[PDB]
Amino acid sequence: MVYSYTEKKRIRKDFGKRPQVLDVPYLLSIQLDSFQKFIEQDPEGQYGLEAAFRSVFPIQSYSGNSELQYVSYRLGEPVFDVQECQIRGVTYSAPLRVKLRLVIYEREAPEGTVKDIKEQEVYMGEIPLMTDNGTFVINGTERVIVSQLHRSPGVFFDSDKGKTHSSGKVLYNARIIPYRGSWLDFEFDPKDNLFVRIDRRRKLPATIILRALNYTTEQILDLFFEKVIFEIRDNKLQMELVPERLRGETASFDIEANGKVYVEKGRRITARHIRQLEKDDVKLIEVPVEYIAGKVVAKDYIDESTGELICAANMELSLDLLAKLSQSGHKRIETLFTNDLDHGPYISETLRVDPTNDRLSALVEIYRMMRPGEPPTREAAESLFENLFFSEDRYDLSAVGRMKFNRSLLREEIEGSGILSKDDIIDVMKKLIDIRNGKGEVDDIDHLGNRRIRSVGEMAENQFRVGLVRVERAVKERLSLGDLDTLMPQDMINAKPISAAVKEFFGSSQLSQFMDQNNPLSEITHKRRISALGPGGLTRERAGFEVRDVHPTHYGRVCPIETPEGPNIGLINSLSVYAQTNEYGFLETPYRKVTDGVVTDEIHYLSAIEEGNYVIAQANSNLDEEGHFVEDLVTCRSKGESSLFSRDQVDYMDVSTQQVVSVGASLIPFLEHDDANRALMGANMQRQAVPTLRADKPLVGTGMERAVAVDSGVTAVAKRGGVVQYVDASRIVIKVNEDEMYPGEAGIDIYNLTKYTRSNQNTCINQMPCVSLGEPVERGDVLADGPSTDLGELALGQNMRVAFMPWNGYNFEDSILVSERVVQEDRFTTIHIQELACVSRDTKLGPEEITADIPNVGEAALSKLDESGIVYIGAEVTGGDILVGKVTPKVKDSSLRVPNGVSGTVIDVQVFTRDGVEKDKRALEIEEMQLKQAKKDLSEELQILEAGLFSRIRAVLVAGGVEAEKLDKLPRDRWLELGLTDEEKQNQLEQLAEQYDELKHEFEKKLEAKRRKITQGDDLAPGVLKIVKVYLAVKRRIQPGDKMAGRHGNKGVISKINPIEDMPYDENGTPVDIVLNPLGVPSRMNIGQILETHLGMAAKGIGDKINAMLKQQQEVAKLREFIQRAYDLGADVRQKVDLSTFSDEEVMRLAENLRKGMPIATPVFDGAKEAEIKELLKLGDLPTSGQIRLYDGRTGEQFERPVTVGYMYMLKLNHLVDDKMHARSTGSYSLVTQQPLGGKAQFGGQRFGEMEVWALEAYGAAYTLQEMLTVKSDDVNGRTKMYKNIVDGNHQMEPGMPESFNVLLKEIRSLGINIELEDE
Amino acid sequence: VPLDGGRFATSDLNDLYRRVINRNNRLKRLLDLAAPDIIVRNEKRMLQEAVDALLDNGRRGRAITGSNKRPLKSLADMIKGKQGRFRQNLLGKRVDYSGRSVITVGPYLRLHQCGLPKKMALELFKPFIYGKLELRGLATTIKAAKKMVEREEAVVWDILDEVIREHPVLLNRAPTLHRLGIQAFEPVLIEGKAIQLHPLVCAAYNADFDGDQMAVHVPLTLEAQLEARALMMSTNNILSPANGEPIIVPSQDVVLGLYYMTRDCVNAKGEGMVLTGPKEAERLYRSGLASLHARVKVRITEYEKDANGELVAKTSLKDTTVGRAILWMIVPKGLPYSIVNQALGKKAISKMLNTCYRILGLKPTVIFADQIMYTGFAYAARSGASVGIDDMVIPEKKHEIISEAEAEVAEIQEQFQSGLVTAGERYNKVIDIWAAANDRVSKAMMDNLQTETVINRDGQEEKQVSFNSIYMMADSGARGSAAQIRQLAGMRGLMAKPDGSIIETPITANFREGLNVLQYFISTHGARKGLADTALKTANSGYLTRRLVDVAQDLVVTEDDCGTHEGIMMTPVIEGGDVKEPLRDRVLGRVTAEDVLKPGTADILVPRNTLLHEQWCDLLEENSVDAVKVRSVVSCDTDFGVCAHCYGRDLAR
DNA sequence: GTCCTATCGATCTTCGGAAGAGATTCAGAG
DNA sequence: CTCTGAATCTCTTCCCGCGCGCCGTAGGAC
Ligand SMILES: [Mg+2]
Ligand SMILES: [Zn+2]
């Protein structure tokens, strides 16, 4: 057994029992391997930019009769890396270069070119790149593309009751949904006439398509219907009985011959009669003329002699018609079999709607129904009809759509073309008619086998296609008209349409979300959201219980708990922990192979429609350490049904008890106990915790923290193994070991940590070291904590000591009462960093300046600016302080002032300048910083190679060919001028001194390039001269009104900040830190929070025994004994750990991190039994009831009965109150109508909205209302007369008439509608 | 308007008029230059099709756009509907002198107060503050007083605490379904930043305290203060508008405390002695000499208001408990002690409070309600009424009840395994076997909770009502009655599929114990349905209330008595057998339509237009009356309104 | 690079809203 | 031959507050 060097510092005591056979996949492979799938070229041309190019090129005009064609593409390295790009505020992007070859043919000749011109990689655009954290950077702002989930291409059959006609019956419908191009709907009319339409246009008679494919009705009838024949021999019109065509229906008429009668008139027909029908060989039989007089004919019948019609396919027969046509010599008359149950006549019925004659008349009807007002025309019509279904420019089932289609038509194969074909539509019709004949089933729409995930590497491939589609339309014309003589490919194309397409996508699409960089969980659970909304999806306002609800295939694929309750429940889901995207995009999830009777430890991923074909055991099911099930019969799910089945009947097993959830819920301990309301609100509140100041560890967790904090990319992780060379909380630098070094390198990995910086939500993000100088580290160890982490565990909140009890009502209803001790400790203080910016311009009156020489202001304000016109770093500032002394010509003091209300310390400034514009000493101050920071880190390589190279001189001197009359005092390349002879050592000296010079020249260009990065200005917007951004850090504390939450979806405002003496304290005199209310636990059934408290209490107790054993100077062998006795506690828990191997050093180093509570894991559905919590509390010296008697610090009286006390984990949420408290006396008003502005970002007035006005009207209160909506609001006179009457204290109003109502009058009178006020 | 740098905001109409005027410039040209019919029919079409845009863009074949297919908002799009003047700016509009904050509970408030932050009061009341600094002559005028407020000088608070000293401020949450959703309170100043609201009133707002923001408005004029104090002040609104039922209905912790205070425990310290009054009952409690729920006898006095309305005071021994003696001290002097002499719970105390309003009236009732609140909080504190997992009680018969029912389900299965029962019958009987198990588990668990308390009566054990923590909360009506405790420790029971059809194998577990993965996953088909319903419903409910006020708003009570003799007839609603509502629900407080006779003949009982107030409806309940004819607003023959008598009792008064 | 003039007058606006009601379109017949 | 039934089309409605976040005419000709 082994633990990595960052595990072996706080080995979380694990209570899990099921052995985790599959370790959690890298939590963002959803995203990264999607974008990698876009960006890689791939000669198997599907997927990626290359697939899109090969979707358009080769490209040509017929009249140009020449082409240009895509050869290959290259993607250059990005002009600025992520860190610098996120400073400079551009987007992190890469230049796209494409080998286009233009080919010039000739007339008359064979096509052999007159010339062709490979343009040496024409520039095509700048595609953004994904950062390894899975995020794009789009205008310095960091953005995330959520995966979409939408209806896969294919064919889908559907039906409903009551939603249509409601006379008990149901109507059936088929759709073909291509990936790109037109939708085709087939549907029956109630009277089972069949109809078709494109793109939800008008309804058409369905055979109009078969007509359009030029089947005659005779052929259609041979495609759809079974034949029944009459042979006019042995007697007039004998009949071809196929026996099985009579079963269950009544023999209402005479059928007999030759010996035993099968079934006489009026009786059902059955098997024994059919067998007698077979044994008599009923190949022809006598039937009454009423039977033939029922028929509809199959085939066309002219009279050959007159040459003229008597009957036609699907025309209906009668005795006299039969007589004349058989009399005309047509001795075989042929018709259809149409039993109403099994063979309904729907296509013949459709031929009774049909207005068409034949192909052309249908194409006429198509073109007139689709493009009303354009002329139909034989040469023109096909340029509609073919581009509906048969042409690549406008119809495309991708490979997934073809697969799904073929699977539903039960085809043998799935390598198929993306267009339809005649037989491809006909098969849909046949399958739809089988459904109406009752012999088939409709698909469940909302099934994760019918909806597939699209992620970034596919949405961007489509938007890039829209680009190439608009270049198609330009380049075809330019090629067709062009001379082909001077044009080269970089004339043929230009980037602007591609760049528009892809930049608008990544910038502004409904799915290019601005990342919730709130804390490391919220980064991740956002990068793996599954969204039903957006382009090609549904809409949040326009769906109902059919899709919001969970479905049985969600299990293991989508988390049922973690969805953002509100107007879009379940239109957003979170992709479950273990789930994965299949090749095609369907969600698939891993299961264990059950081989005969033993659970084999191999995992097969199952998609949602493989799963229904097996029976799959629930993850809890026990096994015998050989791996046979222990239970003789076991719970499994099967076909959405679940029940018990035999041992060795079951065929797959779940991989882990965590498989059903997302990371967002998988982090709740004891989730096994909570109402799924309160699980949901928990798993939504964890992603809102703001990173507190001094974050640590949850004492009770699930062991998922060790993964969320690492995979979220925000802790800095050791890229290669080695030893820590230096640390200073800004840099960490690692001497990588030679077993993982690359041979020419210096061999030294710096990590410049990010310090105090705004998150996208204004919380700070300073990384801090966890290493010590000279400490060893191994690849993948956490070197530095992120925000909200410590030692690499996720740590959103603080393990506050809580007791559950009423307290004089301060924790009524939900509220949290808090002791002053928590605020004094800086437990929940949090740092909020704002960014304020002053732009400056080349305006129409002339160019602005930044200066201290501001007009109309004296040193009373300017004392905080430097001499340049920017605030000093470390200035502490408040409302109205001038941060940046901008001024405008013709001079106007327009300068950046700190907005009202806010306050903070100015932690940093940045300065950006156009080209050809002068700097200033705060630009030179920033240059001095950044230059020096680049140069230092470069020197720490050049120094290391210089030292190595002079050793490489010294050693091969000192070992042999010594010249050491004096040695180390000398400049170690002046060592060359010593008198060594022209034996090889002097030539080694000369060569290695040339290697030393070239080592200098190497950095002599590397530092020049770096300084050239810093020396330059930046790509400002048009009009601006320069911009400066100034950052205010605020250390906000905690106060009444702030919100805190547990993990269990318990939440409250904190209501009072009680002084320590008022907190309850125990029989040992320690006060409780928080007092939660009890009644929320039964009333909202989230009792898992109690077991977290008790297990938390035990967690404190073990640290309590350890801390005592470190204050007392216990020897390690006794201390190790107690720690070991803690890890081995409980049943056959999964984990094993041997402090015997920890070398004493690391036992003390471990104890020094347990000494405030042993951290515990309670994996989600696999937790501690109660009997193991008691066992831990007994190992501490604690009361196993979990409860303690408490006393009230207001009197020292005892409380009656003990109360729960223990260490809950509590999160401060980002809804803290000073960010919401607001009030307005008077200020701005809007221009169009004079009502007040609305906001906090503007000094706004609260909306006395519509419902409040009914509320006043429902008291008698008329004067209040009159005021509220005029004098206080709108009447431009009355409010200034009111204000003066109030300062005069007159308490009287003059109410007038609101100017917004006069706006209405003019806006009506701006129609030709004379509205007017009237007098009497 | 210009925006960020030298760019005009795309100001839609000016793009529409621009279309028109361009087209008109061309059409004047091509008319005067005398173009042929086909050309002028072109421009004339394009002009008509442009003025079409300017009036009501998008009633055309397609709305015209100037961006990524954003339709430009035309005039008629400015008038109508949810973003247009009538709803957006006329009917309700933003207002000055307002602010908002997170509310938080303030237990010490008297019912009429709320605390609001000094920062807000100072930024809200500014006009009134200047109206004192000039009146002190301490500031020269606005120009100085503005600065003197900005500097936040030491005087200003003593001025503020004179400005505000009794100026009602209006607090309302949003949405605000009903009149009780805006109320006025006298403010009291606070150091923090939250609005301290009164505990009992949070229920009216449906203000939970979990971070639920609330807006405040100052009324400016004298008339707005007189309306606020007379009508909207919380003391004037103890009743619902909708039904004769209090809205001050006690907060869960208050009723928990009063339940705990008034129980009897058959063994206690100081049990069985005899006392001369509540005051020495309290000395006995507070010194720790008697336990609060100990049995005792006390001398009591109580008061009754006679047939005239004047007090008769009476005195007796009473047999009771220490805590019922202490609680009697809070009741105003006119109620009978028989209302307190019982272990109180949420229904029992609501009627307590209601009877106070019945007998004394409003002004004592609001103070009595305040005292109840303070009392309940204080004894609920001493009670230490915690919750703890050792207090979840599982009846061990549960194990047998499953192990029995499982085989009987398998009997239904074995018949099915022999074809001996139909595919419908197998299912619809199995789910009834699970129901028969579930009722038994629930019944055994409620018996076990009551069973957990038994104690020595100085010799031999005897049982009493269980002090088990979760059972106090159910049996008091604080929170979480039968349907919750059943799930916490009984069984979770049957669950339903998405299409409502029932699961063949229930959740026989409960949240004290673990759900396995499947039981949990099926559990979410419940809860996610219930959340989808909430988020989906909250639209249609609002569109319903809109349609209603916007049809009802034309009515006002406008005559005293329209003079009808017509009306409609009220009976208990008798259906499905028994009566689902009695007559005293329907008829109370309407006026009689016609003379109401004695059951029988010729004896009249109520004159023909008398309000049937409570003493009349109790009288009808003394009689064998079944049907009563009353006036109803549908029959009131007032034109353009309703007469008062036809409407009858005002429920809030 | 700036200023002025115009929109697919050589396509393709999205299927995944329901409803609920009206205006407007057609049966079986006196 | 069109008169009362019914049939397909479009129009209109869809909680209240609130807080962030960003993003914001183009193309051609002189
Ligand atoms: Mg709330
Ligand atoms: Zn009336």
Q: DSSP letters along B547-593, please?
A: HHHHHHTT--EEES-------EEE--EE-SSSEEE-HHHHTTTPBBS
* Cα distance between residue A554 and residue A139, in whole Å: 36
Spanning CA of A665 to C1' of D17, the rounded length in angstroms is 30
Cα(B211) to centroid(ligand 1), Å: 6
How many angstroms separate the CA of residue A1224 from the nearest CA in chain B?
Answer: 5
Give strand letter and number of the nucleotide nearest A477 (CA to C1'). Answer: C10
Q: Say if residue A1307 is in the same domain as residue A1259.
A: yes
What is the number of structural domains in chain A?
9
CATH of the domain at A1011: 6.10.140.1670
Location of structure tokens 């005028």: B141
Q: Quick one: residue B177, left, alpha or beta (phi over 0 = left, psi -120 to 50 = alpha)?
A: alpha
**A1051-1058 and A816-819 beta bridge pairing:** parallel
Cα(B195) to centroid(ligand 1), Å: 15
Question: What residue numbers bound the domain in which B408 lies?
Answer: 389-537
Q: Say if residue A1011 is in the same domain as residue A1141.
A: no
Q: Say if residue A1208 is in the same domain as residue A1095.
A: yes
Residue A451 Cβ under 7 A from any strand C atom: yes
For B205, residues 6+ apart whose C-beta sits below 8 A from its C-beta are: B172, B173, B180, B181, B214
Spanning CA of A159 to C1' of C17, the rounded length in angstroms is 17
Method: cryo-EM
Q: Say if residue A910 is in the same domain as residue A1027.
A: yes
Asked whether residue A10 is assigned to any structural domain, the reply reads no
CATH of the domain at B520: 1.10.132.30
Asked whether residue A20 is assigned to any structural domain, the reply reads no
* Cα distance between residue B591 and residue B604, in whole Å: 15
Decide: B447 and B395 in contact? Cβ < 8 Å: yes
Q: Say if residue A885 is in the same domain as residue A1031.
A: yes
Longest CA–CA span in chain A (Å) reads 136
Residue A514 Cβ under 7 A from any strand D atom: yes
Decide: B267 and B238 in contact? Cβ < 8 Å: no
Q: Residues of B numbered 498-537 whose beta carbons fall under 8 angstroms of chain A's beta carbons: which are they?
A: 498, 504-505, 511-512, 514-518, 520-521, 523-533, 535-536
- The candidate with the shortest Cα–Cα distance to B388, out of B282, B302, B470, is B470
Asked whether residue A334 is assigned to any structural domain, the reply reads yes
B610 membership: H or E segment, kind and range: none
Q: Say if residue A976 is in the same domain as residue A1083.
A: no
* Cα distance between residue A706 and residue A699, in whole Å: 13
State phi, psi for A1112 to the nearest 5 degrees: -65, 140
Asked whether residue A326 is assigned to any structural domain, the reply reads yes
Asked if the peptide bond before residue A58 counts as cis, ω within 30 degrees of 0, the response is yes
State phi, psi for B494 to the nearest 5 degrees: -55, 145
Give strand letter and number of the nucleotide nearest A542 (CA to C1'). Answer: C17
- The candidate with the shortest Cα–Cα distance to A775, out of A730, A738, A721, is A721
CATH of the domain at A1079: 2.40.270.10
Residue A323, number of CB atoms within 10 A of its CB: 13
Q: Say if residue A142 is in the same domain as residue A157.
A: no
Distance of CA B398 to CAs A631, A635, B107, B401, B448, Å? 22, 21, 43, 5, 11
Angle (CA) A1298 A1302 A1304, round 5°: 115
3-state secondary structure at position B122? helix
B202 is in an annotated binding site: no
3-state secondary structure at position A869? coil
* Cα distance between residue B612 and residue A1216, in whole Å: 54
* Cα distance between residue A831 and residue A788, in whole Å: 12
CATH of the domain at A780: 2.40.50.100
**A782-785 and A768-769 beta bridge pairing:** antiparallel
Which residue in A1287, A1302, A1307 has the most chain B C-beta atoms within 10 A of its own C-beta, making it the best mutation to test that interface?
Answer: A1287
Question: What residue numbers bound the domain in which A615 lies?
Answer: 576-656
- Listed in sequence order, the DSSP H helices in A1188-1298 are 1250-1258, 1263-1266, 1278-1287
For A252, residues 6+ apart whose C-beta sits below 8 A from its C-beta are: A265, A266
Decide: A773 and A681 in contact? Cβ < 8 Å: no
Asked whether residue A3 is assigned to any structural domain, the reply reads no
- Listed in sequence order, the DSSP H helices in B35-88 are 37-56, 75-79, 85
Strand partners, B559: B643
B536·A1192 Cβ contact <8 A: no
Q: Residues of A numbered 533-552 whose beta carbons fall under 8 angstroms of chain B's beta carbons: which are they?
A: 544-545, 548-551
For A321, residues 6+ apart whose C-beta sits below 8 A from its C-beta are: A310, A311
Picking from A413, A444, A475, the residue at the C-terminal end of a domain is: A444
Asked whether residue A54 is assigned to any structural domain, the reply reads yes
* Cα distance between residue A803 and residue A1074, in whole Å: 7
B212 is in an annotated binding site: yes
Asked whether residue A1070 is assigned to any structural domain, the reply reads yes
Start-to-end CA span in chain A (Å): 97
Picking from A656, A673, A696, the residue at the C-terminal end of a domain is: A656
- Check the CA dihedral A844-A845-A851-A855 and report its sign: negative
Resolution in Å, one decimal, please.
Answer: 3.0
Closest CB from A841, A1236, A1261 relative to B96: A1236
- The candidate with the shortest Cα–Cα distance to A269, out of A346, A343, A344, A339, is A339
State phi, psi for B522 to the nearest 5 degrees: -70, -35
Distance of CA B423 to CAs A255, A315, A934, B430, Å? 39, 46, 79, 11
Angle (CA) A346 A348 A351, round 5°: 115
* Cα distance between residue B217 and residue B219, in whole Å: 6
* Cα distance between residue A781 and residue A6, in whole Å: 6
What is A267-318 written as a DSSP string? EE--HHHHHHHHHTT-SSB---HHHHTT-BB-S-EEETTTTEEEE-TTPBP-
CATH of the domain at A219: 3.90.1110.10
B100·A620 Cβ contact <8 A: no
Judge whether B11 is closer than 8 Å to chain A, CB to CB. Answer: no
B98·A1237 Cβ contact <8 A: no
Asked whether residue A1226 is assigned to any structural domain, the reply reads no
B227·A1260 Cβ contact <8 A: yes
Q: Say if residue A355 is in the same domain as residue A327.
A: no
* Cα distance between residue B595 and residue B610, in whole Å: 9
3-state secondary structure at position A581? strand
Decide: A576 and A559 in contact? Cβ < 8 Å: yes
Location of structure tokens 């207001």: A1194
